[PDB]
Write an enzyme that holds these catalytic residues in place. Structure first.
Site, PDB file in Angstrom:
ATOM      1  N   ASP A  93       8.868  76.489  36.346  1.00 52.87           N
ATOM      2  CA  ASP A  93       7.844  76.451  36.277  1.00 52.87           C
ATOM      3  C   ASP A  93       7.325  78.195  35.608  1.00 52.87           C
ATOM      4  OD1 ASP A  93       4.598  76.932  35.152  1.00 52.87           O
ATOM      5  OD2 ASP A  93       3.517  75.697  37.113  1.00 52.87           O
ATOM      6  N   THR A  96       1.042  67.607  40.554  1.00 51.16           N
ATOM      7  CA  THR A  96      -0.126  66.866  39.487  1.00 51.16           C
ATOM      8  C   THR A  96      -0.699  67.685  39.086  1.00 51.16           C
ATOM      9  OG1 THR A  96      -0.312  64.530  40.257  1.00 51.16           O
ATOM     10  CG2 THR A  96      -2.014  65.149  38.964  1.00 51.16           C
ATOM     11  N   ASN A 149       6.607  77.440  43.621  1.00 53.93           N
ATOM     12  CA  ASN A 149       7.230  77.566  42.610  1.00 53.93           C
ATOM     13  C   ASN A 149       8.833  78.132  42.525  1.00 53.93           C
ATOM     14  OD1 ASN A 149       5.202  77.170  40.776  1.00 53.93           O
ATOM     15  ND2 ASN A 149       4.976  79.074  39.853  1.00 53.93           N
ATOM     16  N   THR A 200      -1.947  83.949  40.027  1.00 55.97           N
ATOM     17  CA  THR A 200      -2.854  82.905  41.067  1.00 55.97           C
ATOM     18  C   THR A 200      -2.524  83.696  41.642  1.00 55.97           C
ATOM     19  OG1 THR A 200      -0.572  80.868  41.404  1.00 55.97           O
ATOM     20  CG2 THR A 200      -2.403  81.264  42.978  1.00 55.97           C
ATOM     21  N   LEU A 250       6.042  63.779  41.235  1.00 60.74           N
ATOM     22  CA  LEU A 250       5.866  64.569  42.072  1.00 60.74           C
ATOM     23  C   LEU A 250       4.706  65.322  42.462  1.00 60.74           C
ATOM     24  CD1 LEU A 250       9.571  65.119  41.359  1.00 60.74           C
ATOM     25  CD2 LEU A 250       8.222  63.738  42.813  1.00 60.74           C
ATOM     26  N   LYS A 255       5.512  82.853  43.422  1.00 60.72           N
ATOM     27  CA  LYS A 255       4.797  82.388  44.730  1.00 60.72           C
ATOM     28  C   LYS A 255       5.593  81.410  45.363  1.00 60.72           C
ATOM     29  CE  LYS A 255       2.136  78.878  42.021  1.00 60.72           C
ATOM     30  NZ  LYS A 255       0.574  78.791  41.465  1.00 60.72           N
ATOM     31  N   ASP A 258       4.317  84.306  37.779  1.00 57.79           N
ATOM     32  CA  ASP A 258       3.898  83.161  38.435  1.00 57.79           C
ATOM     33  C   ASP A 258       4.858  83.133  39.791  1.00 57.79           C
ATOM     34  OD1 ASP A 258       1.115  82.093  39.339  1.00 57.79           O
ATOM     35  OD2 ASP A 258       2.763  79.862  38.272  1.00 57.79           O
ATOM     36  N   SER A 280      -3.775  70.715  36.349  1.00 56.12           N
ATOM     37  CA  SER A 280      -5.548  69.934  35.140  1.00 56.12           C
ATOM     38  C   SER A 280      -4.915  69.265  33.581  1.00 56.12           C
ATOM     39  CB  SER A 280      -6.542  71.779  35.320  1.00 56.12           C
ATOM     40  OG  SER A 280      -5.977  72.525  34.699  1.00 56.12           O
ATOM     41  N   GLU A 327      16.652  70.051  35.078  1.00 56.96           N
ATOM     42  CA  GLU A 327      17.314  69.731  36.554  1.00 56.96           C
ATOM     43  C   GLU A 327      16.333  69.084  37.718  1.00 56.96           C
ATOM     44  OE1 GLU A 327      20.453  71.233  39.326  1.00 56.96           O
ATOM     45  OE2 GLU A 327      20.568  71.837  37.251  1.00 56.96           O
ATOM     46  N   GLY A 364      14.807  69.410  47.204  1.00 53.64           N
ATOM     47  CA  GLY A 364      15.178  69.972  48.301  1.00 53.64           C
ATOM     48  C   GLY A 364      13.260  70.618  48.714  1.00 53.64           C
ATOM     49  N   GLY A 365      12.871  70.357  47.609  1.00 56.04           N
ATOM     50  CA  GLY A 365      10.878  70.889  48.022  1.00 56.04           C
ATOM     51  C   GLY A 365      11.029  72.157  46.984  1.00 56.04           C
TER      52      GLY A 365
HETATM   53  N1  LR8 Z   1      12.153  70.845  39.019  1.00 52.77           N
HETATM   54  C1  LR8 Z   1      11.597  69.668  39.684  1.00 52.77           C
HETATM   55  O1  LR8 Z   1      12.169  69.262  40.411  1.00 52.77           O
HETATM   56  C2  LR8 Z   1      10.271  70.059  39.869  1.00 52.77           C
HETATM   57  C3  LR8 Z   1       9.590  68.902  41.052  1.00 52.77           C
HETATM   58  C4  LR8 Z   1       8.921  69.304  41.761  1.00 52.77           C
HETATM   59  C5  LR8 Z   1       7.509  70.065  40.581  1.00 52.77           C
HETATM   60  N2  LR8 Z   1       6.254  70.170  41.374  1.00 52.77           N
HETATM   61  C6  LR8 Z   1       5.441  71.160  40.675  1.00 52.77           C
HETATM   62  C7  LR8 Z   1       4.141  70.778  40.794  1.00 52.77           C
HETATM   63  O2  LR8 Z   1       3.663  70.314  41.942  1.00 52.77           O
HETATM   64  C8  LR8 Z   1       4.773  69.722  42.509  1.00 52.77           C
HETATM   65  C9  LR8 Z   1       6.131  68.887  41.974  1.00 52.77           C
HETATM   66  N3  LR8 Z   1       8.256  70.934  39.834  1.00 52.77           N
HETATM   67  C10 LR8 Z   1       9.796  70.800  39.616  1.00 52.77           C
END
Ligand code: LR8
Length: 338
Positions: free
Chosen positions: A172, A39, A159, A189, A37, A156, A154, A41, A109, A113-114
């Site tokens: 995050d 990546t 997140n 950031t 989902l 933004k 953080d 560093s 979890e 929804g993104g």
């Molecule tokens: N808890 C979650 O469902 C989740 C899903 C994606 C995500 N990210 C990290 C940053 O890059 C995009 C994907 N972080 C957490």
């Protein structure tokens, strides 16, 4: 007194877990890998499925050798110790954690929804009611975290994930820290950094309230208030004390933002004697029922489109790389407490 007693109990429960953290509550071969989902560093987030229960999770995978190299040891230990100890409606829940010879793992979890970021860039900007619905959730979440002596550091749009009910889940905690008084690390950031971070001062929770001003501005305008090609150019604008507002901003919104984007941290909303109530009682929040937001009783501005708990459509596509685990233990001493 209702709020005081709520926060006293929240702190009691946090401290119990903080002083006796969970450890080693699953292992890698309990899961199937589905999709990358995101990546970074020194780590990645993967959609995984638990092989016995069938539940989906988001698994954050940190390479110990890269964490050391990039000087994130204390930060990764912060992240996990805080996440296993907190409990709030708008924070992504940690379900398991563990480590192996090569990596650290935090199994969270999955929020299908993104990122808010995607939805904001897709629609352009949010209406003020829409921005205010999300902002209220951040206000309550910071009220909670700050009462625990936690700074988030953080904030933004990337997140903030949007859940099945259209509510926020903050993800995050890589820069989150328990701080009594001041802290000094340069992190965050660039677009969201408070002036006192840029100027290398000892800083406090006021940096989160500055970042909320940046977030509300970006949600309502479609772009952040301080923007430029190079970080140093962003930093010059941040420290200047000058912000231009779109004409479509309400007067109430502009007034709130001038008080959150206050370069003098001793005058910044959220850092005054009345604390968070200067924000909660501001005219821009006059329509907000804080309890109803907390209880998730308010109908959300929109529900993300997704087909089920395993749908990845609201996340984007990354090269699928190995999760390699070395035959030899790396950095054991550094991550003993994880
Ligand atoms: N808890 C979650 O469902 C989740 C899903 C994606 C995500 N990210 C990290 C940053 O890059 C995009 C994907 N972080 C957490």
């Amino acid at each position: 007194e209702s709020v005081k007693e709520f926060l006293a109990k929240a702190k009691e429960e946090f401290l119990k877990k903080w002083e006796s953290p969970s450890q080693n509550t699953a292992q890698l071969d309990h899961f199937d890998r589905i999709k990358t989902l995101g990546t970074g560093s020194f780590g990645r987030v993967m959609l995984v499925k638990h092989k016995e229960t069938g539940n989906h999770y988001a698994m954050k995978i940190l390479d110990k050798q890269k964490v050391v190299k990039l000087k994130q040891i204390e930060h990764t230990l912060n992240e996990k110790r805080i996440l296993q100890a907190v409990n709030f409606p708008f924070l992504v829940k940690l379900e398991f954690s563990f480590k192996d010879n090569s990596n650290l793992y935090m199994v969270m979890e999955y929020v299908p929804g993104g990122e808010m970021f995607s939805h904001l860039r897709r629609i352009g900007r949010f209406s003020e009611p829409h921005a205010r619905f999300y902002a209220a959730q951040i206000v309550l979440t910071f009220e909670y975290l700050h009462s625990l002596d936690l700074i988030y550091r953080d904030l933004k749009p990337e997140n903030l994930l949007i859940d099945q009910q259209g509510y926020i889940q903050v993800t995050d905690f890589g820069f989150a820290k328990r701080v009594k008084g001041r802290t000094w690390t340069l992190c965050g950031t660039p677009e969201y950094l408070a002036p006192e971070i840029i100027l290398s001062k000892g800083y406090n929770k006021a940096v989160d309230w500055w970042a909320l001003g940046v977030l509300i501005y970006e949600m309502a305008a479609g772009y952040p208030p301080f923007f430029a090609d190079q970080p140093i150019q962003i930093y010059e604008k941040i420290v200047s004390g000058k912000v231009r507002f779109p004409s479509h901003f309400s007067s109430d919104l502009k007034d709130l933002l001038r008080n959150l984007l206050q370069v003098d941290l001793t005058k910044r909303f959220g850092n005054l004697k009345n604390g968070v109530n200067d924000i909660k009682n501001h005219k821009w929040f006059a329509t907000t029922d804080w309890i109803a937001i907390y209880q998730r009783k308010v109908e959300a501005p929109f529900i993300p489109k997704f087909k089920g708990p395993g749908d990845t459509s609201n996340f984007d596509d990354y090269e699928e790389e190995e999760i390699r685990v070395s035959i030899n233990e790396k950095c054991g001493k550094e991550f003993t407490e994880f």
